[PDB]
Ligand SMILES: NC(=O)c1ccc[n+]([C@@H]2O[C@H](COP(=O)([O-])OP(=O)(O)OC[C@H]3O[C@@H](n4cnc5c(N)ncnc54)[C@H](OP(=O)(O)O)[C@@H]3O)[C@@H](O)[C@H]2O)c1
């Protein structure tokens with residue numbers, strides 16, 4: 001029954017709380033909306049009135065808030081972190097991880113590790129469900145056992161910023177997948193198809209796309225841009241998705257993809273593979 | 289078995305090589321005739337014109353860039369009497385109906401539309417699925433020939449269906465690529481190995497793949513309540529932009545940020561990803 005504090009009782013915060021409770025720990029919680037602790041009071045959880053009193057209560061602080069900005073606001077009056085390990089499970093950018101690591105260090109925190117939970121709340125605590133962890137190996141190692149309450153942790157690096165870097169990279173893929181999937185479902189739906197039957201038909205094709213991704217990552221690393229699926233042809237197919245959508249009276253996502261491919265053609269990269277879009281991104285700070 | 293092919297691009301040349309490998313008597317036409325050079329050794333006949341290529345065989349395969357190029361290339365093909373047309377040219381549902389009409393008007397026996405769902409290098413593998421729509425009988429007749437490009441799947445008697453499902457599947461592919469390109473740009477600029485990243489990512493991408501049928505049920509059942517609201521997802525998309533700015537790396541997923549923003553405005557911030565589908569079905573708009 002080690003003492004753990006948890007800041008944030010949102011969708012993911014509350015799933016974290018339940019995992020930590022089941023693990024057999026003595027849990028102090030704080031949330032802006034204290035009512036979100038209501039389902040935890042019966043399970044023997046203490047609700048601290050302020051972030052400060054919450055952090056005082058335990059040597060191990062878990063944070064799972066909306067964002068860095070909300071994390072900075074919440075930690076504002078948390079003056080004393082002596083002998084505390086911070087486990088930050090708040091989505092943010094690599095520098096935001098470094099910024100919170102710095103905020104808690106300046107306040108006497110013993111250590112900081114950052115975690116990206118890669119599943120929705122309902123999956124938290126399945127050994128299958130993976131959380132990526134970055135920060136000092138000894139710090140991970142001391143929290144490993146507690147952290148096993150939320151599923152399998154993968155320590156990806158000693159660098160505090162890395163779990164967030166990989167988080168942002170993986171959420172990029174997820175964002176792209178959902179954008180395409182939502183566009184796919186709007187088209188088949190409006191045209192009077194059953195979305196569940198379409199999904200059964202799509203799943204084998206979506207698995208093939210997943211299997212082509214490593215080959216593409218190799219192409220990117222080796223700057224090998226020639227294949228049988230040029231950007232000119234792919235752009236023509238995206239334009240037909242727009243027209244297909246228009247024909248049905250449905251809206252059109254993938255605009256950034258259309259824009260970056262349109263410009264790619266302009267710069268005489270029209271004959272390159274999808275791997276050729278990566279240098280379009282790495283060489284220019286722009287929102288397509 | 290006499291087959292005519294119109295189009296010797298990346299996919300057209302792969303089709304040609306499948307049809308040769310399966311013992312067709314191939315006649316070809318392409319705007320750039322030189323693209324038939326690898327086929328002349330193998331005994332293929334090059335026709336001077338679309339008309340003379342179509343004239344040469346009972347069964348016509350078309351694999352051109354677009355509908356526009358197809359109608360422009362069929363401009364002086366005025367006699368399809370006796371011809372069965374297999375159109376493997378990507379296009380809209382309405383374009384498939386237009387070519388079917390265009391080719392009927394000129395005397396074609398029948399017309400089927402197919403959508404090849406693999407790159408040329410995988411064409412001819414039984415694992416490679418080409419969606420076919422059109423008359424069952426017309427498909428039944430061509431099924432044997434088409435076995436050369438892999439496994440064909442007759443999705444509907446309705447000519448427009450292969451192109452409907454094609455556009456739907458290519459939407460997913462374009463999203464997946466958009467995401468992957470963003471991910472690779474981010475981790476590459478950060479000094480990570482793209483191939484080691486891909487190994488790490490693989491389990492996670494397969495997991496996303498598995499989530500999609502559930503989301504389809506949510507869309508059909510109009511069930512938009514879960515533990516992953518759009519406000520939370522938008523916040524994460526915004527962090528991908530800032531992560532990218534930190535690295536001096538460009539950012540895609542613009543239409544995804546935009547539609548989620550409007551969702552939040554319309555009071556749908558609490559909804560799941562499934563709550564985006566009605567944002568699209570309601571309004572003709574580019575996001
Ligand atoms: N599917 C998921 O839910 C999921 C999956 C993986 C990772 N994550 C990550 O987990 C983190 C939390 O996500 P969530 O799903 O728990 O989101 P959520 O349901 O929106 O909860 C957000 C949390 O942030 C707090 N908050 C927001 N604005 C605040 C403010 N201005 N001042 C103080 N507190 C504020 C909320 O307090 P109130 O309760 O008072 O609103 C709540 O505790 C995010 O960074 C997210 O990306 C989530």
Ligand SMILES: NC(=O)c1ccc[n+]([C@@H]2O[C@H](COP(=O)([O-])OP(=O)(O)OC[C@H]3O[C@@H](n4cnc5c(N)ncnc54)[C@H](OP(=O)(O)O)[C@@H]3O)[C@@H](O)[C@H]2O)c1
Nearest residue numbers: 228229295296297298299300319320352353377378404407
């Ligand atoms: N490549 C793939 O991975 C892939 C996968 C699945 C489906 N497809 C679909 O298959 C079709 C063929 O794609 P592809 O990869 O063969 O594209 P491609 O390599 O761009 O070839 C385009 C073909 O259309 C011809 N063409 C273009 N503009 C023309 C014009 N104005 N007049 C006459 N002919 C013209 C080209 O002639 P020239 O040779 O003279 O330029 C060439 O034969 C497309 O609809 C595509 O979406 C492709």
